[PDB]
Design a protein around this ligand. Sequence first.
Ligand SMILES: [Ca+2]
Ligand SMILES: [Ca+2]
Ligand SMILES: [Ca+2]
Ligand SMILES: [Ca+2]
Ligand SMILES: [Ca+2]
Lengths: 376, 376, 376, 376, 376
Amino acid sequence: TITYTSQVANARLGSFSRLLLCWRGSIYKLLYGEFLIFLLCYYIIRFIYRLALTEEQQLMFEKLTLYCDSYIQLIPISFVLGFYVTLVVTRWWNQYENLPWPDRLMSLVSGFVEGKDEQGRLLRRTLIRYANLGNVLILRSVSTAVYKRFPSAQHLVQAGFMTPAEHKQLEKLSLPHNMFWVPWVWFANLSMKAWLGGRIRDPILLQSLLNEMNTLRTQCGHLYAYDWISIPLVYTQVVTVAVYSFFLTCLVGRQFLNPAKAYPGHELDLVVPVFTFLQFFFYVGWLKVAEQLINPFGEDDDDFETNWIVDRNLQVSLLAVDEMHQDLPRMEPDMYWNKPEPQPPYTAASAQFRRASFMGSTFNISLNKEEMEFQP
Amino acid sequence: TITYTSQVANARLGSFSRLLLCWRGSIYKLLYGEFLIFLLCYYIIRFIYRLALTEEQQLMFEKLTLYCDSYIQLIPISFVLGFYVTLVVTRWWNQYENLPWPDRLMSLVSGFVEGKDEQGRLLRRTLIRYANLGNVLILRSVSTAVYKRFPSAQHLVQAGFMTPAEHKQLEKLSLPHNMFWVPWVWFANLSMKAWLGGRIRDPILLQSLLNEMNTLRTQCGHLYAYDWISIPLVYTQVVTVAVYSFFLTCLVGRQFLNPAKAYPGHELDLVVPVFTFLQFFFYVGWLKVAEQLINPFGEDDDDFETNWIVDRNLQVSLLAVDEMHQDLPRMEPDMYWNKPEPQPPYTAASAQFRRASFMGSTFNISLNKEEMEFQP
Amino acid sequence: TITYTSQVANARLGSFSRLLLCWRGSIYKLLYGEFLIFLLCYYIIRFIYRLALTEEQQLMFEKLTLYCDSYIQLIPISFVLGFYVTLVVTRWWNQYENLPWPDRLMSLVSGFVEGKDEQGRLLRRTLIRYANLGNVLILRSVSTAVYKRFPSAQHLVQAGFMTPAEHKQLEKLSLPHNMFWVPWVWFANLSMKAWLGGRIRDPILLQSLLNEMNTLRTQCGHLYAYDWISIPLVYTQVVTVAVYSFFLTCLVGRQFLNPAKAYPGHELDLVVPVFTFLQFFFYVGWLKVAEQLINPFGEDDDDFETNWIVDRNLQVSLLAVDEMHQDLPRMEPDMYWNKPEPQPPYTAASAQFRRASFMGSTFNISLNKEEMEFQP
Amino acid sequence: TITYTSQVANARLGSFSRLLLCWRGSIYKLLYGEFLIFLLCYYIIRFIYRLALTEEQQLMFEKLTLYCDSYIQLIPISFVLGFYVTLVVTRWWNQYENLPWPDRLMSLVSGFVEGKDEQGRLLRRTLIRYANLGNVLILRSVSTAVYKRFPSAQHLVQAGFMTPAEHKQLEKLSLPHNMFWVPWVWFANLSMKAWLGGRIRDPILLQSLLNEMNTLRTQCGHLYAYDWISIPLVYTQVVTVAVYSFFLTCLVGRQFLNPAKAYPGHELDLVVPVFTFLQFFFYVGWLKVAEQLINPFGEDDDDFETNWIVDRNLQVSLLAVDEMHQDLPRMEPDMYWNKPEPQPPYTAASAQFRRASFMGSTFNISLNKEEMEFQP
Amino acid sequence: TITYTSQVANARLGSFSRLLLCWRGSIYKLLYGEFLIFLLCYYIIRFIYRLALTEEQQLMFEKLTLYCDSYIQLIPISFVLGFYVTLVVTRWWNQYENLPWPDRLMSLVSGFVEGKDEQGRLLRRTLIRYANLGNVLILRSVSTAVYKRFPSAQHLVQAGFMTPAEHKQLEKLSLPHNMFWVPWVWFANLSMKAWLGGRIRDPILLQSLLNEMNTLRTQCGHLYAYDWISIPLVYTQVVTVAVYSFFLTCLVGRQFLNPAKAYPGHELDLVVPVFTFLQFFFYVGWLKVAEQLINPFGEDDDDFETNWIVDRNLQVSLLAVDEMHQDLPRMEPDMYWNKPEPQPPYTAASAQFRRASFMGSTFNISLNKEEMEFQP
Ligand SMILES: [Ca+2]
Ligand SMILES: [Ca+2]
Ligand SMILES: [Ca+2]
Ligand SMILES: [Ca+2]
Ligand SMILES: [Ca+2]
């Protein structure tokens, strides 16, 4: 994930222009190899045409170049790319939206599961750990970075996500399917046990806990679904062939023909087909954005930081349920205890952001005395 | 369903190019027969024109070819295809999103329905079985693969989804409508009986169970609706006629006329209309993706694995409610029992994915001492 | 509603081509009259030009035909049609999604409202009948087919949706607004009475009932809103004028001029403007799909089966709450009572749909012994 | 709001054509003044060119007309308009979806708040009145029609939406912000008081009431947000300049040059630029639809009927909570008391809408005896 | 945020035209510097060509200008810009939708947390303050204006959002991540303490409070996600390069060549390339709208008023929970106490907005006596 929010906070002079000097997660990184292959092929073709063809063979090559340049427009590259890239971007944001965060559940566990003794500590930690374990099992199923971190359940045990007892229980339950669902059943059973044992004081609080845990389970299921049900291979193949065929046709249709022949479009003979290179940049860059976002859980620069999310979730959820349980700042009267209209100060750098309240669009409408009179 | 998530995890050199060597669920599989028919017709027309026409008749054919090539652009093939394919893809992902998974309900049943004795086992298994039976009844209504597996309710009884008593009850209730709704009414009644009999300890837990079951019912209803309310036949017919008319016009408009006549666009006479073939590939491939996804519950390669989903759901839900009921791993203090900042290790293959926390876009903003001062 | 899901289950050879032999709810049915009017006008114009004009008058007509053919492209027919048709299709699927189904509510009523005696029967039937009556009142407000079935509240009483007492109560409550909301207030009051009378054992179950009933009320409100707030007349008028002006210009711009004049585009003189006819087919077909779906509750072939939905809802809801109340199949141990990995059989027609479980995209990643080692 | 649902119920011959004879909320009403200004300017320019220019000055004007006609295509009017109009239409339907209806809340208040005595009447009326007052305060903030009806809180008191005591309380609470939120805090406090006083029998019912009231509050907040956060002025200015520049260029580029000069596109000299007028109609009509829907709470013909909604909501909510409280039709056995398959009759006008139930797409699949056999 | 809702309430003559005289948050403000740079470069190039080139060098420049003008169309500027701007606008409205408003929570806290004594005051104020503190911590993480107001937690303490005890607790809990989540855990714990201490009378009300607080937490998480996961840099770079390359090509391709050469498109030699300037206006204006909305929490004119929202939320939430707690207007019978059909008056300015109720589209359908008869 490359963040440039801070850079683009204000619309300034060449705001996006200053982003063209970025290498990490950039268009240049995505397509320099493809571009180099295309450039090598283009110049090989030019040198063959200019130094390994007789007059009649050069006339044949020129006729073919005119034909290819004329019929390039048949390829619906823009239409295919637009459809495909919109679909990939929509899926990409959905996939992020379905990353499970234990924050709601961890506040509920911290609050509802009672006891500052060792049994309460153990119970709260085990519940939040079941949520983290379920998340990590799905994430190592669908993310190459998480898989390379935890290539086995023994790795998960060594990293502290699973205890040896949990690992043995998983092995005993083993079915011929992904077992990422097991920690949710464990969570439900342990929450029921906590309520029956008096650690959860009310079935309403038990219901709240299970609702949060089930939300996380649905998010994990969506992640599994996106990893399983790929964008149809036929769509991917259509877009790939469109782009490749366009820029293979360009290799012959965008050559600089002999200016002596004074062809209708070939009066000026540059050496660098700058507009062909820009077209390659735009269209192959569109395809490269699709390629990078099609699996947002790979190891691209703009792919999600799944490992960071796993680490942060573990740290925050454990802190919240264990150390922050019934551990509050002293409740004292605040700065505005008897001020009916609190007005927090502004700094010299923010004084210009003090605004009068917007009171609705109708506020400034003006009416006469007779206009405002009620009729019988 | 063809999955290539693993292949497209990272944007590499010709990432999508390597997907053109896939046969299963590919564009070649979808349109080789149509393409062969088109090629045969194109070459029959070429041979007729070149070997069964006098000079004047060949001049007439050339005038018709120029006319057809000129007026091909009248067909709004791209506009029609774009609309239609976006609609089909949206429906396709909705249809997947409405496949019922018993995971939420099965965690709730495992937890809330009490008793390790035979009556508790029977009750939990029967509730989860009612959820599975409702799902399978809708799936065999809307999916050809599931129907071919279970072509009758007697097949459902032989496969263990329904008991003979349930089959008799369904026959007694028979109305002139799809009866996929019956297991939900059975579930509600059996849950009420379980709560009245003390197996469910609280009406709040009963409410949670019924909410999960009703979510599944709404998903099943959406599946029924998508199977019933097809995309309007008029839209389908418009797109079909557009594509067919375009590539029937091409058969005469894309012939290679006599290069002797030196026509404005006909200077070079290839034998293979490569750009016409690429256009056929793109446009008929778009139509073929729509054709494959229009009913995602058929037996295409990229259609959903409904039979696998049925099997997995049955296995997982039965395991969760029966064997995993009040059967938890031993609760022991975890690896980070007294570590306030747990730091799971990285492997040598993942050490590069260790990232500093993103602390917000404003973190690196720099201000002066006077800028940061509060004003009165 | 025309269903062809079964026909389009698999992408086969000319899958959509076989749908062009459908008459009911077809493009031919939608625009044969318009097409015949257009054809008659086109040929009247051709005959006038060819048999009722002098040489100079024919030259004037030819200049006008060239001018019209040149300036046809000014009309943004495709852009206007695309916007309009996307809007109509989105509204159409929303309108279907807001058709109220009593299934969730009827399972809750069957379960929660207790008593196998006459008072319990009466109470459950009356609650589900209030839900059906609310649905039917909105449906006869917004659907021409339902209105023609029930052109008065006396018709509703004769059909059994309303009792004479309910009809008198509605007449007493009469306000100068659509009264489709009344049965929801009746439902809330009768549910409160049932809970106070002991027929509903818990306020949590009462809350569940009222939540389901209120969901139905919100769906009915959405139906009312779509019937009231039409797509803006200005959008409709813009699209209509675009299509009509395009095909009125075509009547003069697409005539076959005298081939003697050998005009740049008029070398070949057919009698049938086939490409103009195809353009009419596509564009007027797009407009006709919009026309048919703009009110999906009319009496078109592809309009919703509101009458069938009303009948089915009444039958199913009454059966569910009355006959199926506390009437369950015998609970006996299932086929897989002691089989930890149930494997339902496959038929010979479905054996090919047996699939290995997808275990996640990272499953086949290969790593070295040193790659998988944790670092300190 | 102009409704034509009834007119467009069925796709008939010239279904949309018959809508071109509508004046109220029509394209002609929206752009006749702009069109008249454009026509006057066009003909002033034509008369200047034809009667106030020498030969050389007319040649200069003709060169400028050819130049302008050639370079008209540079303006991306269609692209800008498409984006803008889609955005405005999406916002418009959201704005309607966020109009608060008290129906759910009023059924809950009617049911849950107990007592047929004066205190119960007063309590129920006051709660529903707080919901109506909150709605009206936001609506008079964001709607010009509602503001012109209630230009002051004293107007609200005179119209009966607020009591003098409520007005005094609002004045006492006055902050420098829109106070539309106050009635929600009043509602929460009065509901708490009703539950503590025994008028609400259970905290679950209190929770239901507060959930409905909070849904209304979120809708009101969305209305406030749409009124405050306008579509960006930069988008609006871009679209306006595109359309204006296009039709100012047209004034000189679409003149009929001297047919004597026999220019490539100027052979025929009409007096009325019919295609320019149609382009103005389409493009300015698109802009006018955007202009009308950008604030759907103004006083356009197609703007929302906020005043009617306010009146209806007040009447219906008061009736529901006061007169309809515990006031039900007599519960008697219905028409189908002992009919397991109720079949409501059809009229002669609806007999054709009787349909057989759709039983799923797989119903008609045919299989052999060996195909349907289970394999071991 | 620039609001012009009031200006665009009604579609009037040149409704959007009157918005072109706006400077704040306008297209002119966004791109005057870029436009001036472009104009300076264009005229430098013109003067170089006309005053620093020999005849042959001018012929070379003219050939290059024709070549560039011909090949400008290769850049898919419109397609790239459309995709990008739609994505930015969608994200922008989502970002606004995820701004947390404490209104729902504050009504629930005002109602449910009991006690008019100092402990009740303190408890209610502390809960609402935890909600405000969580909101402000996320807002200063993601908003430059809020950060410049509160560049440190010590600033938050001085402004009254945090007490010194809360600041010390945050420092003690410090992890290497954004700590905006901490106040939600504090809220959950303090709500649990309030319920155990009798200040919250029921666990159902506790559940309601925690649901509202968790909704706010999810909104804050969405804000964090949008600030972290930027639109992919590759998309941004593609759009930037497209626009820049288009208007750098224009600098040479849109020069006025020597009219003496009488080139096909260069007959008339203006000095100002008006259509090039309009294209710059449109396309760079599209890019500038994207640039301004890409981070809606910067300090642009059309950026959100985060500081105003923070101030208003603090003031309103404190007033609601403290002064408005169990402080209601006197409950007296309303204006329509015994009026079954209340009819609030209209003013002379609003009498035209009195409308008859819309009773559904089927209301005016006419049927015969035989049509309306039920058949047996
Ligand atoms: Ca990737
Ligand atoms: Ca299929
Ligand atoms: Ca219709
Ligand atoms: Ca308006
Ligand atoms: Ca900004």
